[PDB]
C-alpha cells in the first residue's frame, strides 16, 4: 500500500506514514488568538513538499545536516516569502526516505534539534542553504558531537527517528514552530536543524549500488508572515 500525498503542484508517494513522529507531540498550528495580531496568512503555495538534492550515503559517509527554514531559502515561493516578509513562523513536515535494496544493511538516525547551534561562526559557514552541511569523524563539526562536545548516544532526546534499513526505509519528523518568541525573522534565525547520522555503518552485498540515495522532502506547514498593511482614517 502506498499513499500519495499532495500539496498543489507537488506530490510525494509514501509507503506508510505510520512511523510519523511529531516533535514534543505538539502538532504545528498557527498563532492562536492569544488581524490585530497581524497574521498575514498565505497558506497557499508556500505549503508544498519541496525536495532537496539527494545526498549519497556511502560506507565512509559521516553524516549530513540542514538548518530550517534556511534549507528553503530558495525553494521558490517559501524562499520568496522569507524576504517580502520581515516576520514569519512555520512548522514543517520533514519526510526522509532512502530507498535501498533488500541487500543493504544499515541504519540512520534523523534528529530534529531545536536551535541547533553547530559549533566547530560566519553566517555563510553555518547556512549551507539547500545542499546541507556534512559532518566529519575527527569546515565540518565533529559528528559524534554535533559540533557541541556532546556524546552521540544522548542525541535520542531530540525528536528523532531511526531508519534501520532492515525494516522501514523512510522517516518523517513533524516539527512544530519552536522559539523563545511568538513570531520572528525567518531569515536570520534557524528554528530547527535536521541532522542525519549513520548509526550502523552502511554495508551491502558484493556487486550492488555502493551508494544508496537519501532524499529530504521538507514541506512548510501552517506558515504566516508579518504585515506591511498600515491604516488610514478620515
Amino acid at each position: 500500500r502506498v499513499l500519495q500525498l499532495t500539496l498543489g503542484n507537488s506530490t510525494i508517494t509514501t509507503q506508510e506514514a505510520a512511523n510519523s513522529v511529531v516533535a514534543y507531540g505538539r502538532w504545528p498550528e498557527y498563532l492562536r488568538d492569544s488581524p490585530v495580531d497581524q497574521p498575514t496568512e498565505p497558506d497557499v503555495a508556500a505549503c508544498r513538499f519541496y525536495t532537496l538534492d539527494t545526498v549519497s550515503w556511502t560506507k565512509e559517509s559521516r553524516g549530513w545536516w540542514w538548518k530550517l527554514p534556511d534549507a528553503l531559502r530558495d525553494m521558490g515561493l517559501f524562499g520568496q516569502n522569507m524576504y517580502y516578509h520581515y516576520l514569519g513562523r512555520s512548522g514543517y513536515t520533514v519526510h526522509v526516505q532512502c530507498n535501498a535494496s533488500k541487500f543493504h544493511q544499515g541504519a540512520l538516525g534523523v534528529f530534529a534539534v531545536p536551535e541547533m547551534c553547530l559549533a566547530g561562526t560566519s553566517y555563510q559557514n553555518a547556512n549551507p542553504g539547500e545542499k546541507g552541511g556534512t559532518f566529519t569523524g575527527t569546515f565540518c563539526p565533529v559528528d559524534y558531537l554535533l559540533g557541541n562536545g556532546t556524546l552521540l548516544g544522548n542525541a535520542f532526546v531530540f525528536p528523532h527517528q531511526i531508519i534501520n534499513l532492515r525494516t522501514n526505509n523512510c522517516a518523517t519528523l513533524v516539527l512544530p514552530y519552536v522559539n523563545s518568541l511568538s513570531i520572528d525573522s525567518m531569515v536570520k534565525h534557524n528554528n530547527w536543524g535536521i541532522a542525519i547520522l549513520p548509526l550502523a555503518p552502511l554495508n551491502f552485498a558484493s556487486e550492488s549500488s555502493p551508494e544508496i540515495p537519501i532524499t529530504l522532502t521538507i514541506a512548510p506547514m501552517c506558515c504566516e508572515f508579518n504585515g506591511l498593511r498600515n491604516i488610514t482614517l478620515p
Binding site: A107, L152, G153, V157, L199
Partner: protein
C-alpha cells in the same frame, strides 16, 4: 508594639531556605510567556528517553560512532557472551555516560526499573537467534550460553523482529540503590545460533543498545558534583 522574641536562627542566611523576598521592579510588568512546545516538568522525563549505550570504551573505538555498535560476526563460534553488561547505571563506565546516567549523576539514591533495547541493524536477509539473559544481582554473570539459558532470558530471533526489548526489574534490600561502589546484576547476549545469511551479503552485522527508566524509576537527595 506587638512584643516579639527573635529566636536562634534569626539573621543567618540559609541557602537551603525560601522566604518572600522584596522585589526590585515592583512596577515592571513581566513579558507574558507563550506555549512553547516541549516543556519538561520533571527530570525523570529525560531519564525516560532510551539513549545509546557506549558498549566499547576502547580508547580507539571511543569518542566516535564506533563506541556504540557490536560487531556481530561469523568468526570462530566461541561460547562467551557477545557483550556482557553490568547494570550499575552509575558504577559502570559503559552505562555511566548515558542520558539516564547523566541524570542519575545528580542524585544519590535512585530506584526503579531499567528497560533495555537491542535494535539489530544488519541485513534484511540476514537471520539468526541470540539469547539475551538477565543475571540478577548477587550472582555472577553467566559465561556459557547454557548457564544463561537456565537463567531468565529472551531467545530473540533476528529474522523475525529487528529488536529485542526487555525491562530489567527493580530490586534492592536498601530500597534505594546507591550510585557509588557493589551489585546490580548483568545482561549478556549469547550467540544462540550463528547469524546465517544468503549471498555475498557481508558476515558483519551490528546491534545497537538502548536504556531508559520506566515509570517506577525515581531519584532522591540531589547531589551536584561538577567542578574543575
Amino acid at each position: 508594639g506587638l512584643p516579639v522574641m527573635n529566636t536562634p536562627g534569626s539573621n543567618q542566611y540559609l541557602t537551603a531556605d525560601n522566604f518572600q523576598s522584596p522585589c526590585a521592579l515592583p512596577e515592571f510588568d513581566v513579558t507574558p510567556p507563550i506555549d512553547i512546545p516541549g516543556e519538561v516538568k520533571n527530570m525523570m522525563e529525560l531519564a525516560e528517553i532510551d539513549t545509546m549505550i557506549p558498549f566499547d570504551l576502547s580508547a580507539t573505538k571511543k569518542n566516535t560512532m564506533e563506541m556504540y555498535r557490536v560487531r556481530l560476526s561469523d568468526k570462530p563460534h566461541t561460547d562467551d557472551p557477545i557483550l556482557c553488561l553490568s547494570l550499575s547505571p552509575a558504577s559502570d563506565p559503559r552505562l555511566s555516560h548515558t542520558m539516564l546516567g547523566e541524570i542519575l549523576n545528580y542524585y544519590t539514591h535512585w530506584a526503579g526499573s531499567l528497560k533495555f533495547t537491542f535494535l539489530f541493524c544488519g541485513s534484511m536477509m540476514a537471520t539468526g537467534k541470540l539469547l539475551v539473559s538477565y543475571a540478577p544481582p548477587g550472582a555472577d554473570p553467566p559465561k556459557k550460553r547454557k548457564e544463561a539459558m537456565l537463567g531468565t532470558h529472551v531467545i530473540w530471533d533476528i529474522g523475525l523482529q529487528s529488536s529485542c526489548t526487555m525491562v530489567v526489574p527493580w530490586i534492592s534490600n536498601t530500597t534505594y540503590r546507591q550510585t557509588i561502589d557493589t551489585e546490580g546484576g548483568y545482561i549478556s547476549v549469547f550467540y544462540q545460533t550463528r547469524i546465517v545469511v544468503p549471498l555475498s551479503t557481508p558476515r558483519e552485522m551490528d546491534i545497537l543498545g538502548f536504556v531508559s527508566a520506566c515509570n517506577d524509576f525515581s531519584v532522591r537527595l540531589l547531589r551536584d558534583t561538577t567542578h574543575i
